[PDB]
């Protein structure tokens, strides 16, 4: 049972951090690892692996740590690193971190990720607020008759607050695919036709799980590379991490400021 | 063995109803539960759970009953409620009811469902004949080299008969998704681009199985809500059932008049 | 570990053929079985089933044999027949033949298949070079952080060589679907919108695996039928095999000549 597992994880989080309840949770994706320090001074740092139900992250660029950080008037859970469906894990494990965070009191989830940019106006290193998503995985983290509405899955209010921190922030539709292979140029052209502005291999299930659990979501993609076929240059995860590092300072500052506005 | 399991179920149906063979089968979807009265008076009513191979439905609004009803010159098998892929069962179980009906003698399957309306003309409460479908589940109920043709999956002949009952019935293409989460507005815009007029989380596999088993199919979607993002109002299953209830008498009467024409 | 299984198979292949290493591998798809003769005189012919990791092909038209044939200056592994995801096997098995071929020394994979034609200028019996693909299976043969780039998945260089053999060769985008049911006309219209020129139920995963393993790929689809809904006539696998047979002489001559140019 996902709920009981989440509660057990939340209890351990409370016991180890000494904080009975957190207010916000942030998941740092590929390329975002170095932005963790700017969020603030952690009062607790521990391995995600220690927590019940947490499959340790294994992808390059994911620290696999959980930090408790005070940001503004909030106590924030920072999930440095995440796991993905392409790693072979049942979605119950993929969305467990968000569910555990919710069980720990977090009613706002800030989901960040590295994405390929499909819209012509997007440049490498640019942060893009996720306005909506396209779940192209043919899967759902929900089982049974859990008919969750996804109309304002990415809270307009939170995107407005982000815009208050930095007015220049653009928005875009994120397409979530299975992965782990990158897309072919033809698939990218297809995604453009489908209305996608960004492409990645995560986030969508976590967003669905968050909404199902009653939490709001702010999604932020860092354009770590132009989508396959745009430049013709081959994609590389190492380069994705490098591109993310170049914007780490701005990203950390952005997250710290926006969260404090919540 | 799917076929043998279907034969066993068909035998129990014959013994329990006292009817050696049925001619038509109707699967009542979400919101269609109370349409049974308008179909006619059952001569036998029994729990699906008591039939070999039948996984009991669990979604709200699905009774999980089987009724034998005389409609016109036909002996009709009415499956009040269905199971869906989002409930986690292998497709063999999802399409078993249709295969059991075929084994019971039904050469015509009337598959009804609750669907979100995407096309501009559609209104809540409007019945729509399924002209074709878009299987967007990345799955198939068929295994191995069962290369079944789906050119006229939804019999033009049956749609013609349906229009004799109600000349104003409109047609539309049904998009079948995994579920159980409702679609995001972006996904709905994507489906419109793909050619979808209706969207649901069932039916496609049942239609495929019916075709593979030599049965004709008449699909009827009841627009229980406008697709996500159309009205901007959040979708709700309880509201889907309420919408269905408001049109149940009309739907039952429609089904009765159409089936009598078979 | 797929790589270890691949090496083991490669060792058995070397022992059984008396050839320490092969240079090119060709997978003959549906309808291509009779094209074998034109490739040359095999020095060894053995059942795929007798090789480690090879799940025996079962689809009609797939011989399930492995032949070592000298073509031009190359020692070629000819895989007469393949397995498909619709047969229910884990993708590790679906791409094993290609990985085994790579482990045996093949740095070039010629993947042939039978496909439905969507583009108006394509005719039944026409061979079409695959310029790119659309993986619409919601799956990948890769696991974990295998972030493989698919920018030039179908080697432009190899397509140029094929063109030297037959200058009139057309190119097109191949859409890979789960199968085994054929597409509905509405689905075909959708595929056209997505940019597909050809449609089939194989190849994409093999191409991805080949790329991840460092081999170039030349994809050749034989239009064995026009896509569902184009003619209005139902599709049939037996007819697909018949269409393939009608072009077998041309296909075999094409393959023999192109491979000699590698
Ligand atoms: O262009 C892209 N396509 C698909 N995924 C990604 C990503 C994300 N980064 C990781 C691969 O580098 C993977 O976890 C994926 O979700 C960055 N750029 C792209
Ligand atoms: O807008 C919609 N999108 C997807 N499914 C449905 C449905 C059908 N009704 C059920 C959810 O209420 C579910 O089984 C689904 O198949 C009604 N409206 C919609
Ligand atoms: O029109 C078509 N649609 C989908 N697959 C195929 C095929 C290929 N041939 C086989 C079915 O005949 C199957 O393995 C599929 O990959 C030929 N024509 C079509």
Short mmCIF file of N, CA, C and O in Angstrom, two decimals, chain A residues 132-154 173 193-195 205 208, chain B residues 59-60 86-87 136-138 178-187 189-190 193-194 201 228-229 232-235 237:
data_model
loop_
_atom_site.label_atom_id
_atom_site.label_comp_id
_atom_site.label_asym_id
_atom_site.label_seq_id
_atom_site.Cartn_x
_atom_site.Cartn_y
_atom_site.Cartn_z
N UNK A 132 1.96 22.93 -18.67
CA UNK A 132 1.13 21.73 -18.75
C UNK A 132 2.03 20.61 -19.25
O UNK A 132 3.20 20.84 -19.55
N UNK A 133 1.50 19.40 -19.33
CA UNK A 133 2.31 18.30 -19.82
C UNK A 133 1.55 17.34 -20.72
O UNK A 133 0.32 17.37 -20.80
N UNK A 134 2.33 16.52 -21.41
CA UNK A 134 1.82 15.49 -22.29
C UNK A 134 2.45 14.20 -21.77
O UNK A 134 3.66 14.01 -21.86
N UNK A 135 1.62 13.35 -21.18
CA UNK A 135 2.09 12.07 -20.66
C UNK A 135 2.05 11.10 -21.83
O UNK A 135 0.99 10.60 -22.18
N UNK A 136 3.21 10.83 -22.42
CA UNK A 136 3.30 9.93 -23.56
C UNK A 136 3.94 8.60 -23.19
O UNK A 136 4.61 7.97 -24.02
N UNK A 137 3.73 8.17 -21.95
CA UNK A 137 4.31 6.92 -21.45
C UNK A 137 3.34 5.75 -21.49
O UNK A 137 3.75 4.60 -21.30
N UNK A 138 2.06 6.03 -21.72
CA UNK A 138 1.01 5.01 -21.77
C UNK A 138 0.85 4.38 -20.39
O UNK A 138 0.33 3.27 -20.26
N UNK A 139 1.28 5.10 -19.36
CA UNK A 139 1.20 4.63 -17.99
C UNK A 139 0.64 5.71 -17.07
O UNK A 139 0.49 6.86 -17.46
N UNK A 140 0.32 5.29 -15.85
CA UNK A 140 -0.19 6.18 -14.81
C UNK A 140 0.28 5.59 -13.49
O UNK A 140 0.38 4.36 -13.36
N UNK A 141 0.61 6.44 -12.51
CA UNK A 141 1.07 5.95 -11.21
C UNK A 141 -0.13 5.55 -10.35
O UNK A 141 0.02 5.00 -9.27
N UNK A 142 -1.33 5.85 -10.85
CA UNK A 142 -2.56 5.53 -10.14
C UNK A 142 -3.10 4.18 -10.58
O UNK A 142 -2.95 3.78 -11.73
N UNK A 143 -3.72 3.46 -9.64
CA UNK A 143 -4.29 2.16 -9.94
C UNK A 143 -5.72 2.11 -9.42
O UNK A 143 -6.01 2.60 -8.33
N UNK A 144 -6.62 1.54 -10.22
CA UNK A 144 -8.01 1.48 -9.81
C UNK A 144 -8.76 2.72 -10.27
O UNK A 144 -8.25 3.49 -11.08
N UNK A 145 -9.96 2.91 -9.74
CA UNK A 145 -10.77 4.06 -10.13
C UNK A 145 -10.39 5.39 -9.51
O UNK A 145 -11.25 6.08 -8.97
N UNK A 146 -9.11 5.75 -9.57
CA UNK A 146 -8.65 7.02 -9.02
C UNK A 146 -8.69 8.04 -10.15
O UNK A 146 -7.66 8.36 -10.75
N UNK A 147 -9.88 8.56 -10.42
CA UNK A 147 -10.07 9.52 -11.51
C UNK A 147 -9.70 10.94 -11.12
O UNK A 147 -10.56 11.77 -10.82
N UNK A 148 -8.40 11.22 -11.15
CA UNK A 148 -7.90 12.53 -10.77
C UNK A 148 -7.91 13.54 -11.92
O UNK A 148 -7.43 13.26 -13.02
N UNK A 149 -8.48 14.71 -11.64
CA UNK A 149 -8.54 15.77 -12.64
C UNK A 149 -7.18 16.44 -12.77
O UNK A 149 -6.52 16.72 -11.77
N UNK A 150 -6.77 16.70 -14.01
CA UNK A 150 -5.49 17.34 -14.28
C UNK A 150 -5.65 18.68 -15.00
O UNK A 150 -4.78 19.09 -15.76
N UNK A 151 -6.75 19.39 -14.75
CA UNK A 151 -6.98 20.66 -15.43
C UNK A 151 -5.92 21.73 -15.14
O UNK A 151 -5.36 22.31 -16.07
N UNK A 152 -5.65 22.00 -13.88
CA UNK A 152 -4.61 22.99 -13.57
C UNK A 152 -3.53 22.25 -12.79
O UNK A 152 -3.16 22.63 -11.68
N UNK A 153 -3.04 21.17 -13.40
CA UNK A 153 -2.01 20.33 -12.80
C UNK A 153 -0.81 21.15 -12.35
O UNK A 153 -0.23 20.89 -11.30
N UNK A 154 -0.42 22.12 -13.16
CA UNK A 154 0.69 23.00 -12.82
C UNK A 154 0.07 24.34 -12.45
O UNK A 154 -0.21 25.19 -13.30
N UNK A 173 4.96 23.57 -22.69
CA UNK A 173 4.36 22.27 -22.44
C UNK A 173 5.45 21.21 -22.45
O UNK A 173 6.24 21.12 -23.40
N UNK A 193 4.39 18.77 -33.37
CA UNK A 193 3.03 18.73 -33.90
C UNK A 193 2.02 18.47 -32.79
O UNK A 193 0.89 18.97 -32.84
N UNK A 194 2.43 17.71 -31.77
CA UNK A 194 1.56 17.39 -30.64
C UNK A 194 1.42 18.55 -29.65
O UNK A 194 0.61 18.48 -28.73
N UNK A 195 2.22 19.60 -29.83
CA UNK A 195 2.14 20.75 -28.94
C UNK A 195 3.19 20.81 -27.84
O UNK A 195 3.06 21.60 -26.90
N UNK A 205 4.53 11.51 -14.01
CA UNK A 205 3.89 10.66 -13.01
C UNK A 205 3.93 11.29 -11.63
O UNK A 205 2.99 11.18 -10.85
N UNK A 208 1.21 13.79 -11.51
CA UNK A 208 -0.08 13.13 -11.36
C UNK A 208 -0.26 12.66 -9.91
O UNK A 208 -1.32 12.89 -9.32
N UNK B 59 -14.88 -0.11 -10.34
CA UNK B 59 -15.09 1.32 -10.57
C UNK B 59 -16.51 1.70 -10.17
O UNK B 59 -17.45 0.94 -10.41
N UNK B 60 -16.66 2.87 -9.57
CA UNK B 60 -17.97 3.35 -9.14
C UNK B 60 -18.89 3.45 -10.35
O UNK B 60 -18.49 3.97 -11.40
N UNK B 86 -6.93 0.13 -16.40
CA UNK B 86 -6.37 0.90 -15.29
C UNK B 86 -6.55 0.23 -13.93
O UNK B 86 -5.99 0.68 -12.93
N UNK B 87 -7.33 -0.85 -13.89
CA UNK B 87 -7.53 -1.55 -12.63
C UNK B 87 -6.40 -2.55 -12.39
O UNK B 87 -6.39 -3.27 -11.39
N UNK B 136 -4.69 4.39 -28.08
CA UNK B 136 -3.50 5.08 -27.59
C UNK B 136 -2.99 4.48 -26.28
O UNK B 136 -2.42 5.19 -25.44
N UNK B 137 -3.16 3.17 -26.12
CA UNK B 137 -2.73 2.48 -24.91
C UNK B 137 -1.39 1.77 -25.06
O UNK B 137 -0.81 1.33 -24.06
N UNK B 138 -0.90 1.68 -26.29
CA UNK B 138 0.35 0.99 -26.60
C UNK B 138 0.23 -0.49 -26.27
O UNK B 138 1.23 -1.18 -26.05
N UNK B 178 -5.04 4.82 -21.40
CA UNK B 178 -4.87 3.94 -20.24
C UNK B 178 -5.65 4.34 -18.99
O UNK B 178 -6.28 3.50 -18.34
N UNK B 179 -5.61 5.62 -18.65
CA UNK B 179 -6.28 6.08 -17.44
C UNK B 179 -5.41 5.67 -16.26
O UNK B 179 -4.31 5.16 -16.45
N UNK B 180 -5.90 5.84 -15.01
CA UNK B 180 -7.20 6.38 -14.64
C UNK B 180 -7.27 7.90 -14.46
O UNK B 180 -8.34 8.45 -14.22
N UNK B 181 -6.13 8.58 -14.54
CA UNK B 181 -6.14 10.03 -14.41
C UNK B 181 -6.81 10.62 -15.65
O UNK B 181 -6.67 10.07 -16.74
N UNK B 182 -7.54 11.71 -15.47
CA UNK B 182 -8.18 12.37 -16.60
C UNK B 182 -7.07 13.06 -17.39
O UNK B 182 -5.95 13.19 -16.91
N UNK B 183 -7.38 13.52 -18.61
CA UNK B 183 -6.38 14.17 -19.45
C UNK B 183 -6.10 15.62 -19.08
O UNK B 183 -6.95 16.31 -18.52
N UNK B 184 -4.90 16.09 -19.41
CA UNK B 184 -4.58 17.49 -19.16
C UNK B 184 -5.12 18.22 -20.39
O UNK B 184 -5.35 17.60 -21.43
N UNK B 185 -5.35 19.54 -20.28
CA UNK B 185 -5.85 20.30 -21.43
C UNK B 185 -4.92 20.17 -22.65
O UNK B 185 -5.38 20.10 -23.79
N UNK B 186 -3.61 20.11 -22.40
CA UNK B 186 -2.64 19.96 -23.48
C UNK B 186 -2.83 18.62 -24.18
O UNK B 186 -2.76 18.53 -25.40
N UNK B 187 -3.07 17.58 -23.39
CA UNK B 187 -3.29 16.25 -23.96
C UNK B 187 -4.55 16.26 -24.81
O UNK B 187 -4.61 15.61 -25.85
N UNK B 189 -5.76 18.87 -26.45
CA UNK B 189 -5.47 19.56 -27.70
C UNK B 189 -4.70 18.60 -28.61
O UNK B 189 -4.89 18.60 -29.83
N UNK B 190 -3.84 17.78 -28.01
CA UNK B 190 -3.08 16.80 -28.77
C UNK B 190 -4.04 15.79 -29.42
O UNK B 190 -3.91 15.48 -30.60
N UNK B 193 -5.72 17.03 -32.45
CA UNK B 193 -4.82 17.00 -33.60
C UNK B 193 -4.73 15.58 -34.16
O UNK B 193 -4.59 15.40 -35.37
N UNK B 194 -4.84 14.58 -33.28
CA UNK B 194 -4.77 13.18 -33.69
C UNK B 194 -6.05 12.70 -34.37
O UNK B 194 -6.09 11.61 -34.94
N UNK B 201 -11.38 5.66 -21.36
CA UNK B 201 -10.34 4.75 -20.87
C UNK B 201 -10.75 3.28 -20.96
O UNK B 201 -10.39 2.47 -20.11
N UNK B 228 -11.23 17.75 -20.90
CA UNK B 228 -10.45 18.64 -20.05
C UNK B 228 -9.99 19.89 -20.79
O UNK B 228 -9.51 19.81 -21.91
N UNK B 229 -10.15 21.04 -20.14
CA UNK B 229 -9.71 22.29 -20.74
C UNK B 229 -10.72 23.00 -21.61
O UNK B 229 -10.53 24.16 -21.95
N UNK B 232 -12.83 24.45 -18.75
CA UNK B 232 -11.91 24.93 -17.74
C UNK B 232 -12.33 24.40 -16.38
O UNK B 232 -11.61 24.55 -15.39
N UNK B 233 -13.51 23.78 -16.33
CA UNK B 233 -14.03 23.22 -15.08
C UNK B 233 -13.39 21.84 -14.89
O UNK B 233 -13.22 21.08 -15.84
N UNK B 234 -13.04 21.50 -13.64
CA UNK B 234 -12.43 20.20 -13.36
C UNK B 234 -13.39 19.04 -13.61
O UNK B 234 -14.60 19.18 -13.42
N UNK B 235 -12.84 17.91 -14.03
CA UNK B 235 -13.65 16.73 -14.29
C UNK B 235 -13.81 15.94 -13.00
O UNK B 235 -12.94 15.96 -12.14
N UNK B 237 -15.63 12.05 -11.59
CA UNK B 237 -16.32 10.80 -11.92
C UNK B 237 -17.75 10.82 -11.38
O UNK B 237 -18.66 10.31 -12.04
#
